[model samples]
Target: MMAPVQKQFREFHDRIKLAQYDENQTLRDERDAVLTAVREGLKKVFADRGEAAPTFTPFNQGSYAMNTGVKPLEGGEYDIDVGIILNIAKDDHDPVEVKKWIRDALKDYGNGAEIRRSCVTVFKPGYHVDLAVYADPELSGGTLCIAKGKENSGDEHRLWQISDPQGFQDRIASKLSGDDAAQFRRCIRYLKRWRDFRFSSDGNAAPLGIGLTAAAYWWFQVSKRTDPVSQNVTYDDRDALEQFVQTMLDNFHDTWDSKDQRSYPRLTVELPVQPYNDVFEKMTGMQMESFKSKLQALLNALKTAKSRLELHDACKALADHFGSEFPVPEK
Candidate 1:
């Protein structure tokens, strides 16, 4: 619904945006403190062994880095992804071996760190840091490799997986500029909020934030226009979301399942850089069907909201799916 309620949509988007709401710099400050602690922890551990600490170049990854981060809902924590690029060789050590060093270094930090499949997660008070360690591209033949495995994992799962977190970040950053980029990012935030509201966190039920970002990176269109006389700019988020979801639904093709004895809609959004893999791989066929169904419902909601002439009516319709933060006019 490209209703005459762009103002409301913009306000709602603003309410959910992380940078806008985190006015006191609490999260950013904490992230920097955690990052510095991790670096020093690594250096001290290496120094204890009479070895010089390898340079750790940390870059923000995921929603925080991409500028698509939204404030979490109740009982949810903000996820901060930091890529720690190291001047180490993947061939020199096994996956878990290097991850163990990270775990050991952060053993006394925060609530303690644990080795996840692709990163060492350091749990903090309100938020957790996922430190994704990567071998410097120069050390790995100009291709960054991420150590992937958990502690006590078998040989089959322990390996260096190709990745390009910085490349992906840059790719997303270069999509649009100025107001168009702002609108683009806010649209992503809205969809993430929708995902948070509509799906459960159990298993892989909810789609990954990166998955939604990848989809938008490839298909999102700017829905805005400027007045030639008054020089006013109007952004139509409803239209943008509607078209993006519609395009997403259109991309899902029919795949037959002999085991299920039926055809199902499947959507795949591959990472735009090295280690190009489907982000939706962890989700089962049933979950994907649910994803498609939810998208359709969202599309329906947008149209339903658009049909209303009053701002209150329109926002009320949207609030059902976007949650309580969406502002509804008192008219």
Candidate 2:
């Protein structure tokens, strides 16, 4: 049975939040800055070449769009996922040709643009955008066929796919409401931060941000409390976190069917909305194996925090999992 959560864990949330996340201000501002330059630069490229610029809108799609972004744990380059939706017809331009046009449009852009199978990337200082190009409303659609990167996508990744960004946003958002959404989002941020701490800069490829968000979303969708969590309530931040961590650990062995029928017990995560695609499709046996062990270690750390009665000891346990960013109890 779980005991009353220690006061230290309650204080822990208050202390580490700034260290954990902030609103998407930096992301938005930086994203808009890049968009403005790219869009205007694209117009100029078309103008000089004597071709009329087609109507298009630049906006972000993943992570930031989903509100699941975590602060970069390191000082190096940060990246954001963006998309360009153009009004042009698909009659002459198939998805492949469309991607080439996007790449050409941004060729003169800062640091140069490259043709990626999913989207064209325009490089900017400190960051580069994986700009997925699409048509239709780009938000709402029956078949939201969009361009996907074949280059650098690595192994069996497809050339094109269907997506509904807005629907995806809604599905994850609808899972939690009011303050619970904030708490749930915080859980995602924690996992993302942990992923960076544990796996960044290593030879190993850290899990994709989208896959981790979906996996965390799955856990929150199941374990999330019905009532709005408040500090005044007994549930508290500490209890909520413990519940999420514990539940995820218990379900660590959970699996989903992969495209290959033989791939049983594949730790899979799929987007709940349109396309219903496997987010972990690129994950290999080695990556999955490493992820399982590390996730178990985190579960063990969280369990230790819950079991230890001493406030300082429990905080140490959390710190062990979350690193120096996590608040530690003083002597």
Candidate 3:
């Protein structure tokens, strides 16, 4: 027999997906247009300075590439992460100088481009373009490194920090698999939506996006449920989700008597590729505890879906975390 969990996941999926395929296409078009303008502007900047125009290669990084993007909150803008790799030696151009180059190039782009702590950001009324400058791997010590711009520093002192953007991207991609990956991605997106609901303002004590994504995937790979809802023996994708949430709460309980329970759970997520670095450094223990609490709430809500007849009830419970986009089917 077909599983009730299958039908419930399909209903939830139908509502939470990007509402308009055409709008996403339009966003891509916008991204490409600005990419071209920036490329040409930099070429001119190099030519005017009597230097050879550096060859450039573009990379699309971030959630959109990882197949984990969700619709932004109501009235919120979307962001695209793009990197421009320049074929130049290590000493050819300074990081801040390159940041300045891109920022100056985008002066006429949208409202204007400003150097952020990590990327140069161009703002459109409804969208954001975050551009990172990089050097060819040869110049970047074999692993790709992005030129990070610090917002809090003075213009002259703000410089780039080494970042293996592609390494980070590749590591996350490898952890995901087949249909399992699809479900895992949805779980990540839903987790992010829940975080936004609780910590609605800037600098809220919620965990960061990448950390949650990596950790959720870890839980996804934890194990089959030991205490699966007796009402859900059919075992569909929703059951898969149950395993993740259940394992999460169970982990907390398992560690309750040990030193591990004293502090919040630590997700020491790192890049799998060379220059393996901690990706969750910015996430604090308090924020992780907050995430754990929210995930525990999800486990409770999932109990509603255990009985086939309560699937709709479970769906309604889900909407509380993911917002109104998760459709509440009529029972």
Candidate 4:
């Protein structure tokens, strides 16, 4: 399986490289063309199937949507994503049934098109376009939901809707001062640069990037474990959150700067003893054994960098391990 996937990826890379389509202009043009074609194709498919045409929105404009925060990708590479959102009433309708209808509707378009359960993608001459169909059952005049199909029947799908997206944005902006927001943004940027530098020059050995990403995930997991509504936490309360973040950051910096090659990075940095049970209890309850095992594997990979293949394998291994535990949102 790995061999075939690698061969396919290599062929894709070789074709892209040989064409000299490695420029930003070429990439953007290809992305735009693919998206446009996909939208048109879906619209035609819906019309032919007698179903109302789904509204398509370009939701890939945000920084998070574009994967531009701590792990930014280079130019001439892009992830083109669009959401086809549907408005439905809040009822006891089976989401799986709705997903089936969507798949059947897309099949009518006919251009070697196949609907693998929910998502629809078409491969054209120079590009490939992927489509994500969402049904918003709770959508009202002012509210909307972002729905995605589940891979398995037991896996419950999500229905998220902001009553007022603009209002939410304004409130978030108001909560944090401009300087503080800028500071956080700067931190993310620095982390990204540090990760890129480590990958390119340091054989992609540094776990700082992965550690920071994991820290954010664990924080959310901890918060959700404590509070059902995870929205109550604020940036002003970063001091309360600092112990966990600082622990991970300090461990990262120390591991990077450590002279003793045998020393594995500590999960938590040393901090003054405090009596905050709310935070300390959560930290103590976390499953650290699995994290330590992963950290040890990463260290082993870093120590043995004899080939690019081995380096890439190690990077991917560490990445997969983290991803399984702390999956990021896929756009």
Candidate of highest TM-score = 1
Instruction: Give a tens-digit lDDT track for model 2, residues 261-287.
Output: 433224667787768877777776656
Q: What local distance difference test score does each model get?
A: 0.85, 0.64, 0.67, 0.38
Using all chains and alpha carbons, the TM-scores for the candidates as numbered come to 0.91, 0.78, 0.78, 0.40
- The local lDDT score (0 to 100) that residue 219 gets in candidate 3 is 68
In model 2, which runs have C-alpha deviations exceeding 4 angstroms?
1-25, 48-50, 108-110, 137-142, 151-159, 201-204, 221-232, 236-265
Query: Worst ten-residue run, lDDT, model 1?
Result: 19-28
lDDT of 1 by residue, 1-331 (tens): 4447678888888888886213437766776777778777888889988998877787777877777789888888888778888888888888788888778888888899999998999887778888898887887788788999887788998989988887898888899999999889989999999998888556358998899999999999999789999999988889999999999999997778899999878998999998889998787788889989989988998988888977788898888889899888898
Candidate 2 similarity to native, TM-score: 0.78
Poorly placed runs, candidate 3 (over 4 Å): 1-5, 19-24, 47-50, 154-162, 174-177, 201-204, 222-235, 246-266, 307-309
Model 2: lDDT to the true structure: 0.64
Q: Per-residue lDDT tens digits of candidate 4, residues 160-269? A: 32322223224323433554543333333333443443344333244443234334333311211134577453232112223334444344322332353344334542
Candidate 4 lowest-lDDT run of ten: 271-280
